[PDB]
Symmetry: none
């Protein structure tokens, strides 16, 4: 009876049990601990506590959860804290005290479980007590305290579909492990009685799984192990959390989870391939348009036009704002979105800047264009050089409606315009943009492109 | 040819469209029409042969001599000339404000820091006061004498082939003085403050033609003609003003929309079309099925956006809000492949009788939700009210409109061009095979997937 | 030394009271009983018998114990204030105390009476308020240490044994710092007298870990053997922070209660039979036919509402003299330094509907849609705003100020009582005769030139 | 005898004495009331009280002045109140609570005559008593009370030079007629003696002259005319004033004097004048925050707060976006626009930039802040330097809702903050920003400031 129960624990201790952010789990009431996948999804109780360990379940009810206080040769320890929130609304805001999940930037604001009927002060409820006691450890200035600091695992109630219909109850979503970076006392007004009650407000920093966005659940097996030390649990623990226990609060901005919407391109993958014809072509473009910026602005307008038409959308070229000097906007255009005789106008603000293909564009120069954009307006930045990482990061993060055109796209679109209606001769378009054509500035308001 | 030439001038209409670029040269001929690729200004104001000198148009306020008639004396007209622009450096808070699309222009008088005394000691402002007194109105006989104000702005042009900066102007309609004020301006050169005049002006609607018949000027410069005899080549707007007064101003001002307003008939399918029948069946089906009609709306809007080559990608709905109306979310990839930028598409739907129209506020509920980088789309079985379209165009609301006509048209080719069946399966699809696809996600998350 | 046991008990036992606590207030009650008639004894909580100190009287208005003489200075321990809001719609006085405890803001008026001779304030209350204001704006931490905390109390109607009972009970509303004190001129609707008085903006500080205070703070402040710097050991963290930093602490120490900003139709409308209700009736019955005169009135009302804060508001124009459209009127709010400030274009919409009717989210959205970047909106109505409209304004974060029946009626009451001497019909006539003249056809952006 | 006198008074009553805003008047206490021109300038005493009237002088001593109560048949009334503002330091102000003139916007911030050694509440002094008795009528509840209201005529001591020789004393200038828009309690501290004292602060609304940029002094003659009733004294009053008498509070935001002037300031104008105490303060600021970025961000948060408080808006302290590194947004606040009952939250984005006081902020740097602004949001840029002219014109043209705080504004605001809270001790403030910039940093989204 001992050899078997031990060999099973060793068996589950050998195999890794990974979870990932977004993983739909099946949280069933009275579920076993053997079924690896219940009802199509990975079973919760098995993932958190396999049957091989011989350990009881880690309940995940609405609010704050925690298993028994782990007593050990190390010290008294809290294994972990399991958090669960809802999304179904039935109110006015619905809540001024609603839990906010910013997983893309690794930050979650979560509110305590103090009820208006709770007789006492935060936190007489088990949940808030666990939260305070853990907060004291997360605010630890030593490794001896941060080792004891129980990991807060996040879960989110999700609606899961199958073949037909949608199941709202019975499923959860792993959101990650987090550090308690701030705790506050708040006052929430219960609308049922119109009476104010106190509560807790946690600012949490979600740590990123290295190298892939996930967590090995054997770490929890380590935490729950009453025969282990606090330092003996950092074997299957993510490197970020380890770096937190090793460093402190100063490691937070470096280990905090970070997810962008779209991909970011380096200067090398924005510029054409080294040695290719497009490289020498871009160099000749930088050499030719170094003296005159305006012809480069006209070129940029035409290029932008061909780029917007490349997708399929109907584009209408407007004009060029300036004839001398510099400004925030260099050229104006318009995009008719939809079908013919029903399409809606979208003003296209354009900025062009000729620069070394090795050089990159600063985010403030892009922002000088973004700032002029009103509702229903989009932008386009045309350059010979590349775009800095922070530029694209700020664009993606803040959801900036700006089309980026670096060396590569410029070279390709121009090369397509050299073959289409230029007849191979590039100096034809190059010189045509220099004289005659460059005199047309129109000099009108940007929103007046709609009228024509 | 003495009076016969002047009578020959009174036969040929000299219509001057609002926006016509004119050639203004120092010592320009009054006989030659076209000058340097442009219509000569001096000939336009004074054709020569009328026995009348050319109406000068120097910087700011101009006016010809007083006109002596058979009864009473009248001022012919007032010729204004401005000059934009400062090449990306608008400097004056006392700059003239031109809103021709709504027939409104605010113009500032020509008092100068050097000018001693109060406005208008200066000739221009003096003329402005004198005219404004008549523009006040009260009686129709008093409005009858009020001199029209013709507006011009110096526009940099292109002489046949290459650009020319100075020596060219641009017509800007005829205006009524609706407000006179005294303002104080600080001269940047000196730093000291000087008084001046500020004028709110209503540019009247031309009527059949946006421009005006310049023979009106000739009639007003005609000494033999009386005041009430000068209103024959004048726009009906000005006549309505002389009749009524300051009350007729809202209904006579120039009104220009960037686009055209469609009627209910053209927003609906042809009266005898099969698509009209399918539309009627659509309405009869989704009368009490809002959610299904909204999923359908998501699909239809998706196919409409797709029917252009534009890289469109669908998403979800939003029936979670909290007693809030349902809206579908989509996303468009803007520009070429790789060189692309996401755009969130927020759409709403309303199944109404094909005869019924959508109010401006209902569309505005979609417009309001739009953050920068978003576009809206409204889908309905009925039509769209005039005022809604007006507000969308005028205020430049980025919202795509799909009436019953476009709806039925796109739906008709959305089934028997891919389904391999009929409309019934789709009507059942939006109910059963669609179900709940709203989720609890913000519209911004569609660009993150 | 024998009573020093009870005194030590008092000094050692934390005596907490929370914002919203119901206290039994009886003048003849003793300071030894902790409970009286079902509720906590006010006089015990404020001045326990173990201290042997006199009672802290809570007369209606402004109260303060005799000056406390310390080894260093002579300080006023505290200033107890008892307001009496009483009514759901309000009383008859246009200048009544209003509470925004969910945001730690209280508009409170001085005790200057119509029958008061001289300048504000020859009355003891206003005098105490000014003497307190001398310290609440202390130029040093030492001065701020002497500053008497304002303890707000507020008469209420508790639900006891005999099917609820009015009077005899007060409500603790927190400890306050005087943000602002200005000269105001009020008018008694009944007597007809116009008199000066003091208008005070008060900041109810955040309690921190608890939503209230420890009255041992008051015990320390009343202790004549303690220096002012020795009395902060039981004071709120927000208060200590204020004493240290001064005015720089106020924006971050106000009490905040996370509560639904959505209001019902009953809250937005006056009481069933209040003065504001009759005012609203006169307004609706008057402006039922003509919408433009009401647009003018709404312009004035929006102006007053924005000017309450002390903001730099400048009127613009009225859009249309006939017909209907998206925006009814235009104004502006200069924000920043007097030398270099940025203007905020204000877009207004007026709609006179049945006071029982509500404004739809689409009707609000017609206004919100017109808002450019840097622009703010305002919607004025005789009716209310639907729940969903407010929900969408909160959700999608619409920069729009909502002025419904109650706010309109109250504001109009103040305007009438302070400019036309209680003559509503004069104001109405002025709106009818002057609306046509206050109309321009300018773009909203042109308001910056004003 | 009687013929000449009565004809003199009649000829004064039938002749408009127009005085414009900015006019320089010769003021001699021993001058006569006959000469209309004294020492190359207009005689003050003649202008304010012509000899033909036979009325006593309207003395203009330093501070607040008022003639004897006019015993009219309607009742007793005050003719007017003549304010004289002592200084123009041209930037060399040492007292933070000096009177501020903004005549281009018809606003004047004025301060009472309460002295540090004054015993009693404001105002036991004659001046403050005059201002309070006046304010009683300026906020008159009826048209008649407003008819009784004595107009405030503002005068500022000026240095004149008509021959090429500057004369510091002896001459004053007209600054229009004003309405007491606001009268509030305030506490000042004389930096000299170091003594703090209470006083009155006033927001004055200089009214629009209408057709003329000034007033006709026959209005004053009529108010001083004891034979005239109060209602009969408006015959030569400005239209704005009559409109105020009729309407009341509702007229004020529409009758303020307005002067159209360029909002663009030079680098010299955005900086405190050289040789001033304020310039020394700015020097100390730049020198102290030359290496500190985030401390300067905290300080900038505080300063922004104070400026918004000056505007009258209710500001709410939010947080700092980061404790380390750089970014677009440094600090976040909130403004509850409207009244207590009816209001809306306005998110405030802030950016700090401790550059050289001679260095100017580029359009791209400002636009990096503007680009982050949604609707219902406002921005604010705080710098030790100035803003480039191009940045300013880009702000004005596209109407960017951003508050500009350059070196001068910053320094002045800091001087007032220090004098009013730390007893003139700047080190306390600086150390406060250095020691508290770490615990003010949160990783929340700017929209979360509505919950604070
Ligand atoms: Mg309206
Ligand atoms: Mg910074």
């Amino acid at each position: 009876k001992a050899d078997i129960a031990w060999a099973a624990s060793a068996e589950v201790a050998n195999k890794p049990r990974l979870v990932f952010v977004g993983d739909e789990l099946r949280y069933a009431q009275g579920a076993n601990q053997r079924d690896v996948e219940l009802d199509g999804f990975v079973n919760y109780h098995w993932l958190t506590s396999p049957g091989g360990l011989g350990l009881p379940k880690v309940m995940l009810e609405a609010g704050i959860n925690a298993p028994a206080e782990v007593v050990g040769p190390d010290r008294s320890r809290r294994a972990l804290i399991a958090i669960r929130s809802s999304p179904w609304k039935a109110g006015h805001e619905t809540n001024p005290w609603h839990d906010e999940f910013d997983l893309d930037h690794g930050h979650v604001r979560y509110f305590g479980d103090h009820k208006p009927s709770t007789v006492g002060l935060p936190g007489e409820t088990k949940g808030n007590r666990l939260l305070l006691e853990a907060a004291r450890l997360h605010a630890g200035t030593t490794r001896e305290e941060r080792l004891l600091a129980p990991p807060l695992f996040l879960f989110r109630a999700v609606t899961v579909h199958r073949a037909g219909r949608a199941v709202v109850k019975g499923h959860v979503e792993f959101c990650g492990a987090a550090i308690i970076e701030r705790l506050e006392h708040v006052v929430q007004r219960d609308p049922e009685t119109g009476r104010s009650f106190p509560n807790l407000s946690l600012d949490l920093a979600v740590v990123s799984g290295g190298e892939i966005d996930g967590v090995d659940f054997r770490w929890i097996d380590d935490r729950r192990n009453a025969a282990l030390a606090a330092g003996e649990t950092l074997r299957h623990a993510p490197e970020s959390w380890i770096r937190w226990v090793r460093q402190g609060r100063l490691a937070i901005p470096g280990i905090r989870r970070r997810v962008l919407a779209s991909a970011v391109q380096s200067s090398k993958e924005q510029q054409p391939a080294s040695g290719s014809a497009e490289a020498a072509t871009l160099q000749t473009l930088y050499k030719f348009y170094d003296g005159r910026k305006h012809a480069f602005e006209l070129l940029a307008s035409r290029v932008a036009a061909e780029v917007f038409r490349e997708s399929g959308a109907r584009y209408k070229e407007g004009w060029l704002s300036r004839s001398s000097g510099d400004g925030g906007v260099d050229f104006i255009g318009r995009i008719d979105m939809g079908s013919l005789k029903a399409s809606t106008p979208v003003v296209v603000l354009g900025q062009a800047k000729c620069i070394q293909p090795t050089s990159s564009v600063s985010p403030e120069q892009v922002a000088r264009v973004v700032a002029r954009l009103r509702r229903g307006w989009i932008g386009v930045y045309v350059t010979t050089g590349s775009f800095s990482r922070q530029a694209q990061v700020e664009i993606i993060d803040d959801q900036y409606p700006v089309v980026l055109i670096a060396g590569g796209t410029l070279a390709a679109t121009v090369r397509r315009m050299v073959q289409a209606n230029y007849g191979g001769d590039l100096d034809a378009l190059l010189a045509s943009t220099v004289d005659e054509y460059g005199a047309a500035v129109t000099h009108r308001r940007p929103e007046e492109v709609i009228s024509l």
